[PDB]
Amino acid sequence: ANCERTFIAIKPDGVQRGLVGEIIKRFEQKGFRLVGLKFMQASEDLLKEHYVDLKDRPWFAGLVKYMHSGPVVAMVWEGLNVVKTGRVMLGETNPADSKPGTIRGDFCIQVGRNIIGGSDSVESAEKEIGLWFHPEELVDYTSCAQNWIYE
Template identity: 45%
Template sequence: MTIERSLVLVKPDGFQRGLTGEVLRRVEAKGYALRALAILTPTRGMLEQHYAEHQGKPFYEALVEFMSSGPVTAAVIEGEDCVKGFRALAGATNPTDAAPGTIRGDLGRDWGTAVQQNIVHGSDSLESAAREIGIWFPQL
């Protein structure tokens, strides 16, 4: 058994639309446990650390601006293979391509904005999860 931890963010678009409860319901319905939970508006410094691999890319500034535009819900989830599992639950990055039954497929759409507003973020690897959890929940 491989119990993992992953960072899940309900991004400003999802928070503003009141989707935090639905996202967390789906996480728990999938069988993952919530280990930490916070509502905050991320600072530029946090986002620069979180998105360090994207610095210098054309979408970087718009992404940081979007992610700092309002509150997000940050959660640490735990469970068997939860990094891969949550990403499957979230669906394709582009909500238009996301399958029905996924968070993005059911709740997201293309809003025609400079940055994809796709409701959630989930860590993409165990290494990313450890790094991201350290940024959002340094006390863990």
């Protein structure tokens, strides 16, 4: 049921504070399927383009510097409403406003170090996925539990 996808990245602090496994586990246990996984050092050009809608924000320059200061984990997840639900799972932009149970709510404190980010919408998702992944990187397969996750 629905092969909608979404882009999710584990920021540098998430990697530094050893939360990669915990984060990946949350999507797996949820029932979403992993299609892309990459550990890299995103270039500013890549970052600037990814965060184009915020190019004019006072903190923009800081966001790019930070996201570029260390390696990240780029990921792509598939599932019904994965974009909207993914957002719920990460929690509000500001950790202070993220509810316990969400990724940001349980593991971080400051907005400038909120360990993870994702896609805001479907359109944005496809656009972002293409920006980070080459079509030959999105592995396709069927989950042995697909029939128990979807009717």
